[PDB]
Symmetry: C6
Subunit: 333 residues, 6 copies
């Protein structure tokens, strides 16, 4: 009864996780239309990511960023043989189920789209389709995993062409893992308690409205039927798995502001499994050339001579500094 | 002049509440003119909401937003067979009585119009026409109900095309209900005390002007003849009814920033009875298509395959992020 | 003379007060010229209020707003049979004596004109002409009365077409009266002390300049010969009269941001004796229609069916939300 | 030893004070050129005030306002028979000596010109020409007198056409006089201490620079040879003289923002000896009419019927409000 | 060695100081080119100051202000017989050595040019050419002298045409001298300690970087070999010399914002030896006239009749205010 | 890694350090293209620095500044015989390895490019190519050295044409060396502790995320395998070497805002080994002239007569003041 529940939770999880492994070692490319899908595939993309506008443009446009039009996603799935992934707004369950129904290979609960739910992410374990989610540090990654993400990427700062935020997120996650490895089981439990705190945020908001103190009550269901303590337990388990593994239990990709072959190489060299690039490619002057270049960079990242030759023709990345990013997009939690 | 005022008034409450049930399961559409009224009806709207400008436009125009011109409301009631509802300024009793006299089916005391009274809402129990009111959390909803609202909706952030605020309000209300259900009667009484606090606001202002301390006096009439403690009692009663019911005693709709079929479906899927959409439809590129789409979305919300087919043609959208909403229309209390 | 002079002077207040009663139940309309005076009278205005520009325009123009040109006031008094009232700057004694000499029926010491005196209002008891004054709460109203105002109105926020500030002022006054009625005589005395505080303001400024502590000295003449304690006594008397009367001892009108018939009706329904409207009428698209409509609204305010019919044709101009009123004209004290 | 000099010292002061009395009861008009000098004289100005630009224009122009050009002052002295006064920068001794050498009848050490000395005013006693100075309260007036001013005016807010600041200054001065009259000699001495404080400002600046504490040293020469205590003594004397007199020992005029006949009347009615008006007249639409009108207003100020007839034709640009005066010219001290 | 060193320090210092005396009693004029040099000489300038742009223009141009081009300085030295002085950036030793090699008569280490060294001024004693330096108070002047300045001027606010800052600086210096004269030798030693503080600024910055407390260490070499205590001793000596002398041991000129003959006269009348004017003359409408006028003003500054005649044609000149000077240029310490 | 990796690290380090010595005594010029490379070489540049845009332009352009296109670097290495150096983003390891592969003679880890890593610099010891790094004080310089920099320069404020920041950094470094020389070994150890602090920054961020206190743990690996204490030890060694040497163990150049021959001369005269100039030359009006001039200035820096002659024709680089540098590029740490 209980044990069988626990059993499909795990067989299905492992299957979903399994899909992610297919995409490992390659580049996944944001694509807004049939053409771009083709350019992407032709350039050696392991898969494309369908959205309405690339993040750089999302930034320029302002307003609300939602799931791509169904027509567009269709058109893209038709244009290519490789897996098609698509983006949905954080917490927006309906968008995800439409995406799943449409037959996309993976759904990305994306912090670049305007979040739908201020409190919770989608509960991903309920879906058949596998999810990829963003994380700016290990707490985030673990929560996202616990909610059922089959793959995680760094958030970085999307559409900025600036690799710094991606690098920060990778280092934060990695150092946090190494810290876990140096801890006693009990200490790790404390970290698990900290990492589950965000789920309390609804509850506490409501305690405040009701003129009660903001306290965690032991039998109080917080999220999707789970008690705070229950979440702390499950997370704790995941942290232990991580301590053993030395890395994340799922495929872990670098994302955001990859603008040049060297950028991609750098991420790979930091121990990432693969690279997501949207804006770097199509906001570039020669998109197909840049595409192929980044692919070859990810395949050759440990070979400086090759990296050097790979980067001999293209004209871009473009722009957006520390000062005036105007919507710092690494917030979901 | 008997138990007449107790047992008749309750009969009337239940009647008023009764009207609201007619509209349940469907979409109510903001409409500024005869044409839009028609497109709405034709698209399967269960009812239309008459106002001068759709919220998105209200925002753009600035200045004072009042009740629609009587001519316009008339014109709209003529154009369609389904119920016509109309908006009035918070606390503006005269506007409401004119609306009622005009024979509208329901009056919305709306936080999207410029509030008329900084202290109090309209005392709705005195009206024959039934009222719908906005709420951003349970305290608000309960107060609104106590004042005689027959139906409540979430405020969301009107005219932003952003579903986040609506979702926040639904979650706050729901979690607060679950919290009530886990409470002893005495604890619930405490919450009732907290929920009645806002009525003291005009008393306290005057105490301060009078150089007295701001204190609640036991026999002091605060609002429409009621003592603070009296309000606390009635509210408490309502809370208890909620505890039993597991939901609100009246029809409860989602509103504010529904921009796409998926949005409406998400609201339905969170347990709302129905959806209000103004700006999402007529600020969209193909209003009739979007209208019918949202209707069919609300009818088919638990069927992802249908949702998917339903949103295959429309071009539509809106502005309004987070940053620079410039108005933040989620205030009435 | 002594005893005769006394007699004359005591009964003078009641006479002045008496004039105010003539205007009770109707609408007083701001008018800048002969035509507007005519339209006003024709529309059933009980009286006109002569000024250089209507408040909405006063706002737009910036700069210093003074008494209207004598020529203009003349021209207006000639154009109509009903009482002509005129505005003067707060504390500007000369402007008022010129107004009185010109034979206006009432002088309004108006917070919409640029105040002349940062410390004191005109001492109105010395005038033969009766004064109307603005008040945003009971303290203000009582002080203005004590200085000899024969009639008081709410300040509201003039020229905004927004009824909210008017409503706030009405409620603050009323609640403060109810509070008074629930008080022991001694308590009321305390309120009297609080209400007379503002007169100390020029004393204290000078104490500070002189390097002395800011203290009330018992025999020190503050205003027009009166000691602070003397003022406290007179005010206390007036408060007691209010406690008895249940309202203000003088005719009390609603003013500012009345934009539509329903607005005026609302004010009447809150227990006001009558309505001042300047901007609502002439900044409206169809001023004579709006004028007559507001008059008929005030006459028919308890009759929703009539209010409804009354409001069937007009198109009036509205502006000035909460955000960016830029002037906030509710200051005199 | 020293005996006879006292007579001399008193003698000159009284003579200087003398000249001021000639101008009492009338209007002094700012004039920038020969024509305005003429219009002014013709209109019954007792004297003209020569400057480069009228204060309103001084405001508009920004930059440094000095000393009118010598040619211009000459040209003005030629154009009229009445006394010519001229403005100089605060503390600018050279400008004053040139003005005196040029044979002006009075020098105004004016807070409307850009101050020359951040610490001290001109030591006026050393001059043969008599000085008029501004004061925004009694401390200021007394200091200015002690430095040898033969006449003082209120500062008001020059060029604003707003009488408020003038009225404030008059009230502050008057109430401070009445406060003096109610004081024991010892108390008055305290006020004298406070009023002499500003002279310490350059001493203390230097103590701070020298890393000493900011203290008053008893034998230390602050200003023009005088010890702080010495100044406190002389000031005390002047305060006593004021207590006896009930007013200032010198001719006292109202100044700044007088824009209309009623304004001038109001100042006279508050007990001022006369009125300075620059901007009110020549920034008016009909300068000669307005000029004559203000003159007749000052002659007839206690006669409302006359005031009323007097202001039957003119109309005059007047710009600036409380908000955004941008300069706030009442600072010298 | 030991005994000859002093004779030599004294000898060279005294010679350098000697040059300054040649220029005493006259006007030194900022000049950007051959023509201006000529106009200056012709007008009775005792010397010219060569720079790229006059201070008013320096302000307008923004960017970095350096030593004039060598060609320009050459061209100027050729154009005139009187001494040519030239400006260099604070602390910029190389610019000064080039100026000296070019054979200028005096170098000005100027706070109007963009400072080169945030910590220290040029050590002037090492140079054969004599230096003039700015000071806004006595501490500054003394430090500048100790570093070997042969002449000092007030900083004022350069390019503003506003004499106020010059006057402030003159007063601060003078009062601080008078304070010195009233002090015991020990007290003066304290002031010496205070005046030598700024040299510690680069030491303390480094202590903070090194994680040490900011303390003065007794044998620690702060500046050009000198220990802090050593500097306090030398400074103390100079202070004593000042106490005896009643003034500064070097020629002391007024500088900055002298815009009119009366300005220059005022400076002279405050006990300055002479006047620097750049902007006042060439930003004037009639530069040669203004130039000659200011010269003649300095020559007859105690003769009001003459000053008055001297100022009969020119206009205006220049402008700035307190508000928005945008680069307050009196800093360097 | 026992006794042979002390001597073998000495070998490679000393070789790398050796290359730097080749460039000592000359000017290194930023160059964006073939032509500038040529002009540079022709003008006596010891080496060129290849980048996409000169720092002044980097500032103007905003956006992300990365490594130069490979084509451009190639083109430059072809155009000249002297060493070609190239810039890379801080911490961007891939860019550096591509640069090294391309065969550049030196890599500059430059704070003028957009940093890639918010936590760490490239670990330079692992590279065969030698690195030059920027430092704003001794702590920085030492850390950069420990990471394996073979040469260090001051950061200054790049592209501002303002020598002040360069001078500040030189003084800060120098005074901190002198401070070191005055310290006991134990004291120096404390400085070593302080200088190693920045490495803890990513550890502590992660401790905070994990809800632990921010503490240094003794066996915890921080950077490239090293424990905090280990770094403290290595740094301490370097400090001691500095104490002996009286300067930095590597070639030390001045950089940042050198705009004129005198600037370069000043730097040399402060004891720098040579000068970097990008913007000063090519943003100048006559680049070749200015180039040769700065070279000859660095060769002749102790000869004022020569400096003087050397600076006789050129004009330019208006650049950027203290106010509104808008970027403040001296941050890496
Ligand atoms: C090489 C460096 O980027 C620059 O040359 C130095 O840091 C500053 O360059 P500039 O002298 O162009 O401001
Ligand atoms: C969908 C995902 O957010 C996207 O692929 C990455 O964040 C990339 O952002 P960018 O590479 O387009 O800047
Ligand atoms: C001048 C008089 O008080 C005026 O009519 C009121 O302020 C009403 O203003 P509004 O109704 O024109 O806003």
């Amino acid at each position: 009864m209980d044990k069988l529940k626990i059993i499909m939770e795990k067989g299905t999880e492992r299957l979903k996780r399994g899909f992610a492994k297919m995409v490992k070692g390659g580049v996944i490319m944001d694509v807004t239309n049939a053409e771009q899908a083709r350019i992407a595939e032709e350039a050696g993309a392991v898969a494309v990511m369908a959205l309405h506008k690339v993040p750089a443009d999302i930034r320029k446009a302002g307003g609300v960023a939602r799931m791509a039009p169904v027509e567009k996603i269709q058109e893209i799935m038709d244009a290519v043989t490789i897996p098609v992934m698509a983006k949905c707004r954080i917490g927006h369950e309906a968008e995800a189920r439409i995406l799943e129904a449409l037959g996309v290979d993976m759904i990305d609960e994306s912090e670049v789209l305007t979040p739908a739910d201020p409190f919770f992410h989608i509960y991903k374990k309920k879906f058949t389709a596998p999810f990829v989610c963003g994380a700016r540090n290990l707490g985030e990654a673990v929560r996202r995993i616990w909610e059922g993400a089959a793959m995680i990427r760094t958030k970085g700062e999307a559409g900025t062409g600036n690799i710094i935020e991606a690098v920060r997120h990778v280092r934060l996650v990695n150092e946090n893992i190494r810290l876990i490895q140096r801890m006693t089981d009990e200490e790790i439990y404390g970290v698990a308690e900290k990492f589950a705190e965000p789920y309390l945020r609804l509850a506490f908001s409501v305690k405040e409205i009701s003129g009660l103190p903001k306290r965690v009550l032991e039998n109080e269901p917080i999220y999707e039927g789970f008690t705070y303590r229950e979440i702390v337990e499950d997370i704790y388990k995941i942290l232990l798995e991580i301590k053993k593994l030395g890395r994340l239990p799922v495929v872990n990709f670098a994302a955001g502001g990859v603008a040049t072959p060297a950028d991609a190489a750098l991420m790979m060299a930091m121990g990432m499994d693969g690279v997501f690039v949207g804006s770097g490619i199509f906001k570039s002057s020669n998109p197909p050339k840049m595409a192929r270049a980044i692919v070859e960079a990810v395949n050759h990242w440990d070979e400086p001579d090759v990296l050097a030759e790979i980067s001999r023709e293209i004209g871009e990345p473009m722009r957006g500094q520390a000062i005036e990013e105007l919507q710092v997009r690494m917030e979901e939690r």
